[PDB]
Design a protein around this ligand. Structure first.
Ligand SMILES: CC(=O)N1CCN(c2ccc(OCc3nn(C)c(C)c3-c3cccc4c(CCCOc5cccc6ccccc56)c(C(=O)O)n(Cc5cccnc5)c34)cc2)CC1
Ligand SMILES: CC(=O)N1CCN(c2ccc(OCc3nn(C)c(C)c3-c3cccc4c(CCCOc5cccc6ccccc56)c(C(=O)O)n(Cc5cccnc5)c34)cc2)CC1
Ligand SMILES: [Zn+2]
Ligand SMILES: [Zn+2]
Ligand SMILES: [Zn+2]
Ligand SMILES: [Zn+2]
Ligand SMILES: [Zn+2]
Ligand SMILES: [Zn+2]
Ligand SMILES: [Zn+2]
Ligand SMILES: [Zn+2]
Ligand SMILES: [Zn+2]
Lengths: 144, 144
């Protein structure tokens, strides 16, 4: 609750808007705004690595989308955590959501956002709380 | 020349006097006078935002002072330009100069003023010329 629900609201709004191309109070609005700026940047600056990762995952059916969590928890959870990696996790989610629309699996975009939220909140809860959650995310990307 | 040299004279005089506490003809005198009034106001009214920005920059050595230009060009150059932002750029310079004196880096105050001048004149030359330079700055802040 609260941190999970807020995270689910931000990630699912961002994935939905990235796929379609269309568009806790102020924190969620600010988080979406920062995520649109930084997230879109990451996707442009790492299109090559994101395309190569997308090819290795080879998404054809809805069983392929459900199998993403297995790679996701291990890859994301390994190493040191920082806001840069959280953005990469979410931006690659938006990149996968765009290809889901392309292959007529648009309905598996909301469960994808929920899978991303499970990996983020269930592996990094303590770090997120100490970093002031989504408010900490907004001020970390405030300047530049 | 002229616009650059005049800008360097005003900014360096203002940063030097703010740090120490002591004190083109009439235009430069008037500009300094307007900058003392408006600049000191900005520093008092935005002490919280200036302290938070100063903490994020974390200035300990002279390599930290030289690295300021990187953040400065991007932050200043983004968005719409107006005299309010130019004052903010210079007032924050005066705020940084005060802390430089506190940490025995008083000699890196003149190169700081020159770095600020480079960002201002090399990114906003055309706008400054059309706004009548420092004369336009003086009549913009004449009333109130
Ligand atoms: C401002 C600021 O602070 N910054 C600084 C840093 N900057 C930045 C930005 C990108 C950078 O690399 C992208 C990259 N390059 N390559 C070669 C690969 C394979 C990737 C790469 C590609 C895709 C995701 C990641 C993730 C997410 C977890 C897995 O997510 C999923 C896994 C599987 C399925 C998923 C489905 C949905 C959602 C997430 C999924 C990571 C990671 O965990 O870091 N990587 C890196 C990495 C991973 C493994 C080995 N090697 C490197 C990724 C480096 C720096 C961003 C902005
Ligand atoms: C007279 C009149 O008409 N007015 C109307 C406007 N008024 C006013 C006044 C201040 C206001 O906000 C201050 C503020 N708040 N916060 C949260 C932050 C982080 C700041 C803030 C703090 C520090 C500078 C700026 C700059 C300068 C460029 C970068 O300078 C440097 C960057 C780095 C190193 C440097 C070193 C030496 C010199 C300049 C440097 C800007 C900018 O570009 O505007 N900001 C704003 C801003 C920037 C980014 C995100 N968010 C907001 C700044 C709002 C309204 C004054 C009176
Ligand atoms: Zn990058
Ligand atoms: Zn099956
Ligand atoms: Zn398969
Ligand atoms: Zn594993
Ligand atoms: Zn491992
Ligand atoms: Zn701001
Ligand atoms: Zn103000
Ligand atoms: Zn930049
Ligand atoms: Zn920018």
């Amino acid at each position: 609750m609260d941190l999970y629900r807020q995270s689910l609201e931000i990630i699912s709004r961002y994935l939905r808007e990235q796929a379609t191309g269309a568009k806790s109070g102020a924190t969620s609005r600010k988080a979406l705004e920062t995520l649109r700026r930084v997230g879109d940047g990451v996707q442009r600056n790492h299109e090559t690595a994101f395309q190569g990762m997308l090819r290795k995952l080879d998404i054809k059916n809805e069983d392929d989308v459900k199998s993403l969590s297995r790679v996701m928890i291990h890859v994301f959870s390994d190493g040191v955590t920082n806001w840069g990696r959280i953005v990469t996790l979410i931006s690659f989610g938006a990149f996968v959501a765009k290809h889901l629309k392309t292959i007529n699996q648009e309905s598996c975009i909301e469960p994808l956002a929920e899978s991303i939220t499970d990996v983020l909140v269930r592996t990094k809860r303590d770090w997120l709380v100490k970093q002031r959650g989504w408010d900490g995310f907004v001020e970390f990307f405030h300047v530049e």
